[PDB]
From a paper:
The rhabdovirus matrix (M) protein is small (∼20–25 kDa) but plays a number of roles during the replication cycle of the virus. The M protein is an important structural component of rhabdovirus virions, forming a layer between the glycoprotein- (G-) containing outer membrane and the nucleocapsid core composed of the virus nucleoprotein (N), polymerase (L), phosphoprotein (P) and RNA genome. To further investigate the role of the N terminus and hydrophobic surface-exposed loop and to investigate the structural conservation of M across Rhabdoviridae, we solved the structures of full-length M from VSV serotype New Jersey (VSVNJ) and from the lyssavirus Lagos bat virus (LBV).
Residues 48–202 of LBV M form a globular domain with an overall fold that closely resembles those of VSVInd Mth and VSVNJ M, with 2.8 and 3.1 Å root-mean-squared deviation between 138 and 139 equivalent Cα positions, respectively, despite the aligned residues sharing less than 10% sequence identity. Strikingly, in the structure of LBV M a stretch of peptide is again observed bound in a shallow hydrophobic groove formed by the β1–α1 and β2–β3 loops of the globular domain. W112 in the β2–β3 loop sits under residues 33–35, its indole nitrogen forming a hydrogen bond with the carbonyl oxygen of P34. Overall, these interactions bury 830 Å2 of surface area. The interaction with the most likely monomer, related by the crystallographic symmetry operator [1+x−y, 1−y, 1−z] (23 Å from E37 Cα to E48 Cα), generates linear polymers of non-covalently linked molecules in the crystal. The structure of LBV M therefore reveals both a novel 7th family of PRM-binding domain and defines the interaction of this domain with its cognate ligand.
Author numbering: 30 to 37, 48 to 202
């Protein structure tokens, strides 16, 4: 099955703490998650200059295996990642992210509530490129959310963020 039943030029190093709690009485599937996040561009309430970071994080966070905590499945990610932007996209100097938002999906019988918490502070710990050593789910999620990128000509494995 695919189902999860109820619990019963500009470069930045960001220390990142990511948490998504999914709330679903009837349980949920990856398919539903992909439908929800399809429209993240038009739901995200945070700092636009940082939506690139958030999408990346949301993708990695949801590509892990969660844990049951109360009436929620809980995905946690805690990494130090390096992001590179093209042109003039991305955060201004010394700018940081403290984002949280409830996204609630509701379609007839199916009902899923996503609680997203992403914090990102600039640290001096050399971090890892977000776009290497990910898994198919991470990629699949970045594709859904329409993650805008452009390829680095220097390094093959590198993607510049366009948002």
């Amino acid at each position: 099955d695919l189902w999860m039943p109820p619990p019963e030029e500009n470069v930045r190093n960001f220390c990142i703490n990511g948490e998504i709690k999914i709330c679903s009485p009837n349980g949920y599937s990856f398919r539903i998650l992909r439908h929800i996040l399809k429209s993240f561009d038009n739901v995200y309430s945070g700092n636009r200059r940082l939506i690139g970071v958030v999408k990346v994080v949301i993708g990695l966070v949801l590509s892990a295996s969660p844990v049951p905590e109360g009436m929620n499945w809980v995905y946690k990610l805690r990494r130090t990642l390096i992001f590179q932007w093209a042109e003039s996209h991305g955060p201004l100097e010394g700018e940081e992210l403290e984002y949280s938002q409830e996204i609630t999906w509701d379609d007839e019988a199916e009902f899923v509530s996503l609680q997203i918490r992403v914090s990102a502070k600039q640290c001096h710990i050399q971090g890892r490129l977000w776009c290497i050593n990910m898994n198919s789910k991470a990629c699949q999620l970045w594709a859904d959310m329409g993650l805008k990128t452009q390829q680095s000509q220097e390094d093959e494995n590198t993607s510049l963020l366009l948002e």
